[PDB]
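Reading group handout, session on sequence-to-structure problems. Before we discuss, look at one worked example. The prompt was deliberately terse, the way you'd type it at a terminal:

> structure Exfoliative toxin C

The input record follows.
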Amino acid sequence: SDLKDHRDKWNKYYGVSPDQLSKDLFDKVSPEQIKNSPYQSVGALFVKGEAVATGVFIGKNTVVTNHHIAKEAKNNPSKIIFSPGAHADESNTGTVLPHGTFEASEIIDAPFGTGVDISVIIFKPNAEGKSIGDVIKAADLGNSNSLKKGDTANLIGYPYDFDSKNMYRSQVEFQSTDFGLKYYGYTVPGNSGSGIFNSEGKFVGLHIGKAKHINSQNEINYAVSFNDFLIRDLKQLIK
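And the output record:
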């Protein structure tokens, strides 16, 4: 059955302890790798007192994350802090913030309406007058429609529940790509807002969380899928 198939695919990511997953399925991003694309567009988001998540920098002071995260700031931008390329020091004692932190200027909660789980956050330049785009490169946006069932891609973000400091790459395999993206892969709640990057390094969707799949007792990952309308809006925003 479809259930047996689903359980076998899900068991590949959830049937062993996560510290036992092979590096091909789930791997810590090293400080060397974090300096390159596509890793370098990704950062940790902290909503003071409310939530942890991942954000992806798209240009021109602008970061995307999920609406389910950003709304918890209640339109109070000073509560949202982003640190691009945050990682643990060699001892796991502290988080190294290679580019420091940025504090939000403006939150736009539901720019694509309430049915699309993405928010746009505009950040203040830091104390040096430096924008995010002055220290890292923007993600390279692309459409979701080149993805299909059975394709693999890379989910990149901060799986806080597993490791509170480091960025990780989770391999994902698509189950379907019409009802947004649905896929198998190892994720935890912190991964809210993780980028989905295709084999060419394009940013082609935004991880949300887990949705019911097949019936009420089973689930799968799902993401915001980037269509032509959404892509065009974000390109005009960063012009």
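Points for discussion. First: Helices lie at 2-14, 67-70, 228-238. Second: The first strand starts at residue 26 and ends at 28.
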